[PDB]
Design a protein around this ligand. Structure first.
Ligand SMILES: CCCCCCCC/C=C\CCCCCCCC(=O)OC[C@H](COP(=O)(O)OCC[N+](C)(C)C)OC(=O)CCCCCCC/C=C\CCCCCCCC
Ligand SMILES: CCCCCCCC/C=C\CCCCCCCC(=O)OC[C@H](COP(=O)(O)OCC[N+](C)(C)C)OC(=O)CCCCCCC/C=C\CCCCCCCC
Ligand SMILES: CCCCCCCC/C=C\CCCCCCCC(=O)OC[C@H](COP(=O)(O)OCC[N+](C)(C)C)OC(=O)CCCCCCC/C=C\CCCCCCCC
Ligand SMILES: CCCCCCCCCCCCCCCCCC(=O)OC[C@H](COP(=O)(O)OC[C@H](N)C(=O)O)OC(=O)CCCCCCCCCCCCCCCCC
Ligand SMILES: *[C@@H]1O[C@H](CO)[C@@H](O[C@@H]2O[C@H](CO)[C@@H](O[C@@H]3O[C@H](CO)[C@@H](O)[C@H](O)[C@@H]3O)[C@H](O)[C@H]2NC(C)=O)[C@H](O)[C@H]1NC(C)=O
Ligand SMILES: *[C@@H]1O[C@H](CO)[C@@H](O[C@@H]2O[C@H](CO)[C@@H](O[C@@H]3O[C@H](CO)[C@@H](O)[C@H](O)[C@@H]3O)[C@H](O)[C@H]2NC(C)=O)[C@H](O)[C@H]1NC(C)=O
Ligand SMILES: *[C@@H]1O[C@H](CO)[C@@H](O[C@@H]2O[C@H](CO)[C@@H](O[C@@H]3O[C@H](CO)[C@@H](O)[C@H](O)[C@@H]3O)[C@H](O)[C@H]2NC(C)=O)[C@H](O)[C@H]1NC(C)=O
Ligand SMILES: CCCCCCCCCCCCCCCCCCOC[C@@H](O)COP(=O)(O)OCC[N+](C)(C)C
Ligand SMILES: CCCCCCCCCCCCCCCCCCOC[C@@H](O)COP(=O)(O)OCC[N+](C)(C)C
Ligand SMILES: CCCCCCCCCCCCCCCCCCOC[C@@H](O)COP(=O)(O)OCC[N+](C)(C)C
Ligand SMILES: CCCCCCCCCCCCCCCCCCOC[C@@H](O)COP(=O)(O)OCC[N+](C)(C)C
Ligand SMILES: CCCCCCCCCCCCCCCCCCOC[C@@H](O)COP(=O)(O)OCC[N+](C)(C)C
Ligand SMILES: CCCCCCCCCCCCCCCCCCOC[C@@H](O)COP(=O)(O)OCC[N+](C)(C)C
Ligand SMILES: CC(C)CCC[C@@H](C)[C@H]1CC[C@H]2[C@@H]3CC=C4C[C@@H](O)CC[C@]4(C)[C@H]3CC[C@]12C
Ligand SMILES: CC(C)CCC[C@@H](C)[C@H]1CC[C@H]2[C@@H]3CC=C4C[C@@H](O)CC[C@]4(C)[C@H]3CC[C@]12C
Ligand SMILES: CC(C)CCC[C@@H](C)[C@H]1CC[C@H]2[C@@H]3CC=C4C[C@@H](O)CC[C@]4(C)[C@H]3CC[C@]12C
Length: 998
């Protein structure tokens, strides 16, 4: 027992340092947030007229508004006041450290951090984007990387630790190579015929599909009969793949003999599994099948323990909270429906709740589970499931990732021009004329219409810039030469950009600025910032590194697309066009008509006596295979996963009003898709990526990636600083006056005392709350002097002792800086207390931030936190280059969105402050969706194409389609951005992982 106890202490010691780092960073950021905005979110609107709150369209909750300029304003007739109630159920805010640590925890884990990021900005202001980017990068991305690296190192160390029929049979053995190609082509054609379905399905089309299925079944059955006849059970049946083929074909002909053909729709797509037969031709698909098999096979024990854990947690939650869930339904249920959409009453819903927790969404059900049970018991269960659940899942993801993978005078002029081009006077000029040109696009926003001078200046700048670029291009042509220029890869990335701009501007100036293709091309002017990729050394290097994996990414992309086509043909069959519903739309907010009044289309048509009954489809549905792909991508990115998963369960059949959870068991389809097209299809992409960088690195022979030569030598210098830190030993003072001061300073317990004092300062900083007694305010202020005075005295003592000898140490300079900063902050506060200098309290609470600079002293005294911070220090250049590339991508998409969706109707995620009409708002939205959070909410107001959800007919300034977007371009934009950002962030994670690996 003692041996296993010690073993458990071990394998936790591995995460000891990372856990302490997480706790300390969370505490520091909690203190920063608490000081910045405490009890600020409780700023609901109240009508000047008891309490009168207005509600934002589409949401019953009150509207958090705040005083300031950046912060979100409030409708006329309302004054933002510190109404005493927190926005979400009264359970989310920064009014105290205990409520600030949890908010930062859920901001690190990223669960629904979109709401927090758009609330705290609405209240405090837009300028607070800095805190959120900092906590996401330094907090979320960094801490998850380090935890993943800890688990990876632990498990890597574990891994490396240890008659007539006979005549026909003779003639039936043709088995020509043409036969296998023919059968494979037959499989592909069967799939492509079964993958062309839709809502229309004219009778001729239905008959054609039926006869096609019949003939293909006939061919497959004839082939199986011929093979079994030619072979015997010992030869034919003995094969695993033959058994699979026989099972699928017999399940296809039995249903082909059923009364209701594939009425189940699970059997109408059971034959579709045969596409696995393409495993022979496809190595990547073979590897995917191997991944799944070994996950269920050799590595099946880990999955079994995961499943039993999830089942046990779901059962415990049900048994403990179902009675309260039923007794208090009205407390958490939606305004109209009588039951919560997600609850824990019966085992199925408890298991779905636990799966939602494991999926990365827990607070939404946490809050509600607090207003139906004791806060203590419901808080433990929700947190323990997350930590244990996400640890066990990431334990499988690595186990699968380590077993399947790795287990005349003209020529003189030409030469002169060639030499001139290489000159710095032109190179640097072009580099910063490519930066200014890219930057100038940010001012082309929707509000630009209101500043005629600004747009005129911008168009002058654009014309001059394109003229300059044409001159540069023709000079480069006349110097370098046609073949030399066109050989390079980037040379033509500039040529096509220049031509796009040229033809667009020529069309505009030719009084032909009305052609739809011309307008679309002009909308592609967001490609101008792309021109800065070649010039910058680091961005060019990272671009080359990324392009080095296109061959290794295309195969996995194709395999994922096929394995998703299967699930997009299973979903289209199970439920197509069955998502339509009859809604009642009185104001923005609408209530689907109860099935008592209208239960089908004609009823919703004859009872239109209210003037508002509407029959409209869900925004994301399963009508055809393209929408199936979109609705599977939303479930894979885990955003919009409920609007298309609620429609599924409430639908009954074609042209019938959805009923409350009639298809309560249709959640299994989405659960299965999540499992397979997620944990078993991203694991493939990741393994392929960790072998395409491991290769090409062993090929590079250790050459650093994402880094230039100057950055490499700087990295080497810093690596030496990792051992050069110590300076010469300090001589002891000779005179008693300085000698006694020195020998008192340098002592066994001096450092312990200073650390304890910093800990006490942290304690007295965290005891702070919102709206506390004036007595406690005075106490904190006075103890905020007992500490600043003491630290300044100690710093001046150590400065007097040893004179300039100690100044050589860098961190001594750092702590001197923090102490003098505290003194300066106190002086500034005292001076600003005057009657002449008065500003918002935010200025007080931001100047008071110097204390955290004064409590960062523990870093120099830390054990492993300092090592991890050193690793981050070394990795900074690589992450800087990748961040430059990511910001360039974000800028491209910002310009695209600003040009394309500045008129959509403000619904769901979009608001009056998170629109696309301004560059700041566009950057805010793109930063939010960079992690694929709320992208569904931003997409939904674009999918709308007709009334009432959007009014296609609406002046909308000059906006076309009124308040309705273009679903095709919206889907392309958002899907491309999320995929590209996933690639860039996984590059960042790989860079950090390898930097810590060294
Ligand atoms: C959706 C698809 C979901 C799961 C994949 C199922 C794979 C079916 C393979 C059919 C062909 C066959 O029978 O080939 C067995 C291979 C032969 O390969 P070999 O041993 O000769 O080498 O054997 C193996 O690799 C091991 C068996 C096949 C790969 C592991 C599959 C484990 C999944 C189990 C149940 C899935 C239920 C799906 C529910 C809807 C979703
Ligand atoms: C996995 C892939 C399967 C995807 C499709 C799963 C089933 C989709 C929905 C469906 O058509 O399911 C068939 C039935 C009904 O389901 P329902 O949602 O209409 O419930 C109706 C409840 N009522 C009758 C009280 C109103 O299922 C039932 O009778 C309940 C028992 C079976 C539930 C589906 C089991 C699928 C098994 C998956 C393991 C692999
Ligand atoms: C990047 C951001 C975050 C990660 C930091 C990673 C570690 C940074 C190490 C900084 C460092 O080593 O530089 C200390 C500096 C410069 O000294 P030196 O390195 O040239 O070595 C001098 C001694 N010789 C000559 C023997 C080499 O010391 C001085 O002079 C005084 C100035 C001290 C500045 C460094 C502070 C680094 C730690 C915290 C920054 C704030 C983080 C905030 C996070 C968000 C919370 C809201
Ligand atoms: C590992 C590597 C990454 C792998 C990722 C795989 C993800 C696969 C799914 C991607 C989304 C596909 C998707 O949304 O469907 C294709 C989309 C949507 O369909 P639609 O017919 O336009 O919809 C109805 C139509 N709008 C209408 O007018 O009613 O409409 C289109 O036809 C647009 C296709 C382009 C955008 C989506 C697919 C390609 C994305 C590539 C991004 C790569 C970035 C690097
Ligand atoms: C939409 O749903 C409604 C209600 O289900 C359908 O109307 C219904 O039509 C049926 C068949 O005519 C009616 O059944 C009949 O009821 C009368 C007595 O009212 C009885 O004498 C007949 O023998 C038969 O049982 C049903 O009552 C009627 N319900 C109502 C209130 O309208 C409607 O046809 C559906 N429309 C579509 C196209 O989905
Ligand atoms: C129930 O009755 C209402 C009212 O007739 C129907 O709404 C109507 O829907 C049509 C088609 O969407 C609308 O046509 C267009 O509407 C826009 C926006 O008003 C307008 O700009 C166009 O000129 C054109 O009229 C129609 O206006 C709209 N009428 C109203 C006032 O709602 C609804 O479709 C009916 N629903 C059912 C299921 O019977
Ligand atoms: C479906 O939508 C319609 C239209 O919004 C709803 O009817 C509307 O109900 C409101 C009351 O919530 C009516 O406003 C007021 O009603 C009171 C009734 O005493 C009246 O005294 C006021 O002068 C005022 O009219 C509104 O007029 C009425 N509009 C109509 C005629 O459709 C309907 O209740 C909704 N039904 C469901 C089940 O969602
Ligand atoms: C580092 C950690 C994160 C710190 C927070 C993120 C970075 O700090 C944001 C604040 O500095 C914004 O400036 P103020 O505090 O002056 O707020 C604006 C107030 N007026 C000027 C409009 C009245
Ligand atoms: C991927 C697999 C190959 C491509 C499969 C492509 O799917 C083709 C279907 O979408 C065609 O039908 P629609 O969705 O255009 O529906 C027709 C709507 N009307 C004509 C009835 C109005
Ligand atoms: C690659 C895939 C090739 C797929 C070839 O697609 C052929 C058909 O799906 C075309 O169908 P339509 O888009 O014309 O829809 C007609 C539907 N109604 C009007 C008859 C109902
Ligand atoms: C997949 C491979 C390619 C397959 C191509 C299939 C082409 C054949 C299917 O194309 C569909 C169109 O012909 C229209 O749909 P129908 O054939 O049902 O005719 C209905 C006509 N109305 C009612 C719309 C006027
Ligand atoms: C949204 C994009 C995010 C970034 C990732 C995706 C990038 C896609 C590709 C964009 C750039 C495509 C052109 C640049 C990539 C290829 C080039 C990538 O770097 C070029 C070096 O590999 C080779 O140098 P050069 O091509 O200048 O010339 C050397 C001699 N050879 C190579 C010509 C024989
Ligand atoms: C089996 C255990 C349960 C697994 C739950 C599901 C575990 O996560 C599923 C992943 O597919 C989620 O992917 P990400 O969150 O990384 O988003 C990336 C989306 N794209 C960019 C790849 C499309
Ligand atoms: C309802 C449909 C669409 C989804 C479920 C598909 C199921 C039934 C599939 C996926 C995994 C498949 C099995 C995979 C492996 C083997 C072993 C082989 O020696 C015979 C076939 C057999 C036993 C398959 C039978 C069919 C199977 C169980
Ligand atoms: C049409 C206008 C706007 C832009 C024209 C850009 C032209 C010159 C660019 C666009 C894409 C380029 C091609 C992209 C990739 C390759 C493969 C390489 O192995 C040989 C050159 C070749 C074939 C390039 C030749 C130049 C090219 C065709
Ligand atoms: C190691 C310790 C500090 C970890 C945290 C301990 C717990 C008990 C801390 C976390 C936040 C703390 C609270 C933060 C702020 C206030 C307001 C103050 O006017 C009274 C104390 C009170 C209400 C604190 C009580 C103790 C508290 C709940």
């Amino acid at each position: 027992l003692k041996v296993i106890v010690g073993a458990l202490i071990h394998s936790v010691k591995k995460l000891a340092d990372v856990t302490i780092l997480t706790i300390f960073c969370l505490s520091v950021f909690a203190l920063v947030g608490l000081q910045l905005f405490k009890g600020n979110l409780k700023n609901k609107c109240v009508k000047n007229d008891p309490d009168i709150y207005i509600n934002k369209r589409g949401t019953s909750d009150p509207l958090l508004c705040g005083n300031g300029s950046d912060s979100g304003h409030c409708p006329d007739g309302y004054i933002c006041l510190k109404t005493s109630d927190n926005p979400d159920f009264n359970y989310t805010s920064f009014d105290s450290f205990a409520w600030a640590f949890l908010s930062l925890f859920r901001l690190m884990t990223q669960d629904s951090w979109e709401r927090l990021y758009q609330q705290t900005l609405r209240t405090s202001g837009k300028i607070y984007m800095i805190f959120f980017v900092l906590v996401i990068f330094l907090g979320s991305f960094y801490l998850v990387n380090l935890i993943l690296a800890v688990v990876t190192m632990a498990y890597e160390e574990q891994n490396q630790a240890t008659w007539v029929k006979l005549k026909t049979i003779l003639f039936g053995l043709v088995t020509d190579p043409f036969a296998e190609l023919t059968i494979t082509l037959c499989i592909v054609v069967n799939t492509i015929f079964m993958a062309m379905e839709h809502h229309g399905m004219s009778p001729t089309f239905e008959a054609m599909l039926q006869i096609g299925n019949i003939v293909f079944t006939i061919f497959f059955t004839a082939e199986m009969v011929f093979k079994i006849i030619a072979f015997d059970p010992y030869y034919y049946f003995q094969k695993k793949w033959n058994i699979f083929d026989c099972i699928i074909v017999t399940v296809s002909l039995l249903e082909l003999g059923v009364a209701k053909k594939g009425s189940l729709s699970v059997l109408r797509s059971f034959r579709l599994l045969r596409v696995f037969k393409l495993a022979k031709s496809w190595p990547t698909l073979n590897t995917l099948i191997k991944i799944i098999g070994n996950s269920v096979g050799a590595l099946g024990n880990l999955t079994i323990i995961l499943a039993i854990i999830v089942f046990v947690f779901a059962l415990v939650g049900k048994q403990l909270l179902g009675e309260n869930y039923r007794n208090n339904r009205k407390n958490i249920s939606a305004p109209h429906e009588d039951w919560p959409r997600w609850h824990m009453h019966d085992f199925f819903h408890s298991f779905l709740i636990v799966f939602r927790i494991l999926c990365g969404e827990w607070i939404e059900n946490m809050w509600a589970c607090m207003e139906v049970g004791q806060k203590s018991i419901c808080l433990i269960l929700f947190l323990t499931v997350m930590v244990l659940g996400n640890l066990v899942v990431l334990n499988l993801f690595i186990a699968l990732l380590l077993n399947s993978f790795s287990a005349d005078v003209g020529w003189q002029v030409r030469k002169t021009c060639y030499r001139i081009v290489e000159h710095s006077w032109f190179e640097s000029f072009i580099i910063f004329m490519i930066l200014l040109s890219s930057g100038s696009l940010a001012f082309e926003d929707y509000y630009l219409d209101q500043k005629p001078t600004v747009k005129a200046l911008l168009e002058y700048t654009d014309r001059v810039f394109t003229f300059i670029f044409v001159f540069e291009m023709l000079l480069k042509w006349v110097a370098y030469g046609f073949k030399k220029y066109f050989t390079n890869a980037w040379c033509w990335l500039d040529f096509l950009i220049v031509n796009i701009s040229l033809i667009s501007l020529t069309a505009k100036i030719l009084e032909y600025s009305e052609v739809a293709p011309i307008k679309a091309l002009r909308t592609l002017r967001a490609l101008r910032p792309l021109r800065a990729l070649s010039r910058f050394e680091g961005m060019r290097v990272v671009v080359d590194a990324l392009v080095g994996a296109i061959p290794s990414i295309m195969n996995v992309l194709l395999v994922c697309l096929i394995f998703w086509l299967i699930f997009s043909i299973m979903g289209v069959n199970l439920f197509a066009g069955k998502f339509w519903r009859c809604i009642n739309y009185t104001d923005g907010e609408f209530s689907l008509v109860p099935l008592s009044i209208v239960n089908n289309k004609s009823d919703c048509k004859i009872q239109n006596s209210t003037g508002s009954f509407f029959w409209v489809n869900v925004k994301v549905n399963f009508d055809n295979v393209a929408m199936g792909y979109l609705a599977l991508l939303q479930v894979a990115t885990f955003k919009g996963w409920m609007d298309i998963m609620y429609a599924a369960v409430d639908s009954r059949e074609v042209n019938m009003q959805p009923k409350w959870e009639d298809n309560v068991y249709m959640y299994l389809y989405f659960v299965i898709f999540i499992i397979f097209g997620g944990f078993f299809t991203l694991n493939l992409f990741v393994g392929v990526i960790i072998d395409n960088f491991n290769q090409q690195k062993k090929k590079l022979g250790g050459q650093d990636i994402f880094m230039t030569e100057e950055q490499k030598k700087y990295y080497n210098a810093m690596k030496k600083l990792g051992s050069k830190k110590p300076q010469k030993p300090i001589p002891r003072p000779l005179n008693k006056f300085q000698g006694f001061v020195f020998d008192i300073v340098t002592r066994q317990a001096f450092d312990i005392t200073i650390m304890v004092l910093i800990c006490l300062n942290m304690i007295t900083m965290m005891v702070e709350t919102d709206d506390q007694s004036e007595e406690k305010t005075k106490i904190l202020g006075k103890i905020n002097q007992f500490f600043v005075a003491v630290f300044t005295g100690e710093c001046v003592m150590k400065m007097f002792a040893l004179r300039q000898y100690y100044f050589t140490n860098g961190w001594n300079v750092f702590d001197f800086i923090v102490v003098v900063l505290s003194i300066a902050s106190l002086i500034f506060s005292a001076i600003l207390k005057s009657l002449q200098s008065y500003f918002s309290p935010t200025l007080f609470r931001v100047i008071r931030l110097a204390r955290i600079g004064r409590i960062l002293r523990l870093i120099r005294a830390a054990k492993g936190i300092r090592t991890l911070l050193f690793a981050l220090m070394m990795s900074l250049p690589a992450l800087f280059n990748i961040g430059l590339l990511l910001f360039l991508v974000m800028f491209i998409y910002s310009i695209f969105g600003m040009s394309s969706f500045p008129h959509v109707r403000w619904e769901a995620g979009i608001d009056d402050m998170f629109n696309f009409q301004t560059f700041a708002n566009s950057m805010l939205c793109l930063f939010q969706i960079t992690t694929s959070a709320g992208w569904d909410g931003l997409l939904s107001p674009i999918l709308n194409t007709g009334p009432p959800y959007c009014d296609p007919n609406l002046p909308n300034s000059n906006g076309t389609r009124g308040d309705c977007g273009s679903p095709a371009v919206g889907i392309i934009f958002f899907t491309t951005y999320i995929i590209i950002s996933f690639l860039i962030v996984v590059n960042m994670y790989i860079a950090v992982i390898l930097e810590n690996f060294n």
